[PDB]
Amino acid sequence: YDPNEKTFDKILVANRGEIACRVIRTCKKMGIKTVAIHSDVDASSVHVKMADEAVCVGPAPTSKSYLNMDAIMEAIKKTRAQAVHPGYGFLSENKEFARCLAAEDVVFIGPDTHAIQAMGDKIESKLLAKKAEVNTIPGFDGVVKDAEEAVRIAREIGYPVMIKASAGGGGKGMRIAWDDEETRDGFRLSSQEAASSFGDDRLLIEKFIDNPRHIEIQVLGDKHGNALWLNERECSIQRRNQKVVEEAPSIFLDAETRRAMGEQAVALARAVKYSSAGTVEFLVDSKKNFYFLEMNTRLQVEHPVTECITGLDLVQEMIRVAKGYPLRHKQADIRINGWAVECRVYAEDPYKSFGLPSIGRLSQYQEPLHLPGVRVDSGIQPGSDISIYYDPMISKLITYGSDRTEALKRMADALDNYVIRGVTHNIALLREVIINSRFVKGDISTKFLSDVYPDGFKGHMLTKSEKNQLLAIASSLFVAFQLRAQHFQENSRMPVIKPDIANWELSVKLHDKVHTVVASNNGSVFSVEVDGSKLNVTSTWNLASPLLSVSVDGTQRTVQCLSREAGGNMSIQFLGTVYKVNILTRLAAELNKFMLEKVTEDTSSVLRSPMPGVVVAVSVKPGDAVAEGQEICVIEAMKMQNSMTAGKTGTVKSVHCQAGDTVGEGDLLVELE
Amino acid sequence: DPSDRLVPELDTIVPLESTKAYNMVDIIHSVVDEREFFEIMPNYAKNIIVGFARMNGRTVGIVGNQPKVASGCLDINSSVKGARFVRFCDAFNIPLITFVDVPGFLPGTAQEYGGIIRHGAKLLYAFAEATVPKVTVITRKAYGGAYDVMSSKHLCGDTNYAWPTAEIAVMGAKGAVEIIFKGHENVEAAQAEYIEKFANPFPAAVRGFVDDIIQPSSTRARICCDLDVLASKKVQRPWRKHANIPL
Amino acid sequence: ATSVNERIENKRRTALLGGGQRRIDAQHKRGKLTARERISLLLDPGSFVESDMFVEHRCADFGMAADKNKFPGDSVVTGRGRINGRLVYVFSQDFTVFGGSLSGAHAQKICKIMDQAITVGAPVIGLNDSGGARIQEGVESLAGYADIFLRNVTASGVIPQISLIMGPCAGGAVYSPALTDFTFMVKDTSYLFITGPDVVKSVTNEDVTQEELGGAKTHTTMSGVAHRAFENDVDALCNLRDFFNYLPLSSQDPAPVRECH
């Protein structure tokens, strides 16, 4: 962070969220004035407040604010910014935007327009990589003509065949075909999908790799012909073909394979004359054979994890390269220092297709910045809201250590000590992935969530000891609240006679099961007797702090009391999973047996909206019957589209929803009989 | 729960546009101890909110306007509910905390025929006769006589605060300009001047009608301290057997 | 030689005429009396002592500081008198000055009268004819209304409070009469509503007449806001004197006992 070196004194960040905040932080560390752009909705974001100046560039939708080139241009001209950083997404990989930027006088922190154009389509990239002597996925060069073309191509290149879209992105427009009928139907289906979404109608036929590992190589280049590979990265835990958990070093690769992959990536970058930061992605089978799969001509989302093991500031290097300085590091100066793990905290419900976008306003937000080896990259502050126009990312949590075990333990601790109240998040899935036996061992693949949770994510499955600990903690918290309720101030008119109770006898209902608990309190230590098991719980019993640390039989556990009711209902986040328990006294439990069960009528007869958003397509008319797997309707929200099925077969009595509406969470859509 | 806990989530809870509504229960939950609120009549007259909470461990009564329901306007049922709750809180030495966002009273022939005047007077009486400490915070709007009915400074209020989005005024800009500039035929500049120099809490602040203009994130810390100094409040009133509430 | 003596006479003759002879004629054509005529009818002859005759509004916005916008008394006549020999404090709102709208001076005079009445322990009678709050005043009118409301609530159960609406009362002018003990109305000339028919049409999208919305019949037969309605002003004042003969002067006094035959 040398301030003597001269660089641009005004950089405009043409992005939003955590990437904008990270770029602003790096620029501020370099003594560079920043300029922020935002929409009307994002008027009180973190990046607009932490950056000098701010320009509103349009309304809420991205197509009118962040994809609106003109507004960016008047903002740059008015602010007289010398440089512009696009981040990732939006206009970062837009060649025409780079051309217009370079037209008048503005420098662009990123690759040359020629490099983006080369690595813009998935066909020309393959031929250029083949010309660059880089291992590529076997297949047929050129665009497949029709169905018969695809079916005769499928004969030679294995039995499994992979159908891809030329202009596809974000894990979209891809399908797997096994049989010839599958190939010929998928050709037409993917052509229609590409015409509707990508508007390109060019398809690629390739070989499908079974159980592949997605390995990225980070490359840094300059305008003087120098290229470096900054080790590798493991990005295999994905849902909807989108990464959630990443690792900086690879437990699967050795020194020789890593060196070969880095050399191939550097050769490809030199062939494309890359002069910025980028990533080359590969698919590696079980036999340690790697094949090239796409090149990203921008800053990777999971870049910070490779900064921990290398000690480099990638944004600073990008800015220095854009200025014109050569690289100050050699290939021998790049080395692996420890282990780093990154998790993407999203605003989505992991119990629905491993994540479903959810809206809301953040009432409470607290990061575990004080925990050892913890870094947080977030554009989120308390009071922030999640809209349907942008990506649902809340934060990126990175933990580093001397080895994989330390990094994973720190990740678990940070996930346990991380507070989000106001929206639903995927912290349960993130914490369950990092403690999985297969993940800990290191035997993972791209199809990891699909075979570890064949029926969908269900939460942490408590063992006997874990269940006993959870019951003891819940009972101790209940008794602590009851004891706190008896501490009144002195009245001097009607003195308070505290109830002298020795043992609290409780019935605790968890899942569908009743447990008998006997609790006793001796100062700050609770002796809990759960179904014939004795446990000791020790804590300060601060009933107001969002995080509560307890010691059960010497084991330290951090729990969160999300909600509590006078009727006995409690919601406790424990080991990352939210459990709903019901605690009653023995007399109350005995008297509750006489209470009549109130009538509840769901019977899977009403289908509501699984997420809020805007309805795109509807294919159900009132009176018409449906069956299992029948597509009901499609809603687009936070960059992704979801079409739901029907469930049990029946006759649709009415269809409350209509196309083009704005349906929220828990809104009735289909009253099927 | 520390009495000086900051609440930064309230800094942007009030939308910039006056048409968009927000939930006052969110503010109430953020301000009170441990975010615990015991609501009274939660499903009846939902345009007003009353309940019991705790501040620094001391029981407090909370009355507030709900902009989600009927844009926060006052009517007969909400007036009666708030009036009786305030009377009960005053009768048993329970301090009152008010959150004000009201554009006036609900118009219509049904309200006039039902006696909206009597019930508005009920609520105004209930707030006026209270001798317990009362702390008022204006969030967005306080228009017309409703501003008086919502425990203003002039009803022997103790401490009154206004958020930067507060607007204390006689009425809306359009009605005021149409009743003042009857024939000026220069509404283009009249709107700008009126919204520039009235549509803000400055006219109330310069006259001392509000004690201070505070940041929302410091609301809780501002209230608790006040409750520390107002716990010994004593006032004297003329003797009477009982008064004549407009019941 | 000083012109202070002629200034006093000019100010008195200006205050006695209210808002001008033309506006007095306009009020008379509507079938209503002036505030001073109502006061003279209400009280025993030669018993009215007026206070704050020279008080004027102190607003200096929207051209209200001009000479033509200054009226001594400021749309309200306040004082004390006697009914059948018993002391009473009275204020009458003058509709000829800014439509009877309430300003800082108006509220100050009313508050002074109520404070003196509660100090001595005498009833308060209020003749209400006011278009609401003076918009040019701003928050000062709201503060004055709130002060009047506070004094009404404080004096509730201490001294009797009588309200007689004799004109169109709108906005915040309808809440002070509601806090009083008894409310009387004059037929076909008095109104009581919070919002006018135009706002009702704008919001609720329904057509209603001013008499239908807030007339004396509406508030005396199907609303429960008013207690009695009278034919005209003279009958209203005669019945008001008759009713005032019943009540005691203060809650510290026993029920009145008259000579019986």
Ligand SMILES: CCC(=O)SCCNC(=O)CCNC(=O)[C@H](O)C(C)(C)COP(=O)(O)OP(=O)(O)OC[C@H]1O[C@@H](n2cnc3c(N)ncnc32)[C@H](O)[C@@H]1OP(=O)(O)O
């Ligand atoms: C705190 C609660 C509030 O904010 S109340 C705000 C006032 N609300 C209103 O709706 C306006 C009040 N005026 C009216 O409603 C009508 O004019 C009523 C009362 C029915 C008068 O009926 P009418 O017998 O025909 O007399 P008019 O229309 O000829 O009016 C005569 C003059 O009176 C004036 N006036 C009345 N109220 C105010 C007021 N609040 N502030 C200032 N001026 C007022 C009018 O300007 C009118 O002037 P002009 O002689 O017609 O030129």
Ligand SMILES: Nc1ncnc2c1ncn2[C@@H]1O[C@H](COP(=O)(O)OP(=O)(O)OP(=O)(O)O)[C@@H](O)[C@H]1O
């Ligand atoms: N030939 C293949 N064999 C097996 N899996 C494949 C193949 N091609 C693609 N995939 C799968 O698709 C995923 C996404 O591939 P790819 O990076 O080409 O897509 P994208 O939408 O362009 O990506 P990005 O979001 O990085 O721009 C891979 O991680 C892998 O799981």
Ligand SMILES: *C(=O)CCCC[C@@H]1SC[C@@H]2NC(=O)N[C@@H]21
């Ligand atoms: C939209 O407002 C947010 C864009 C989020 C970009 C994410 S991350 C990088 C991937 N590349 C892309 O185009 N979308 C994905």
Ligand SMILES: [Mg+2]
């Ligand atoms: Mg990819």
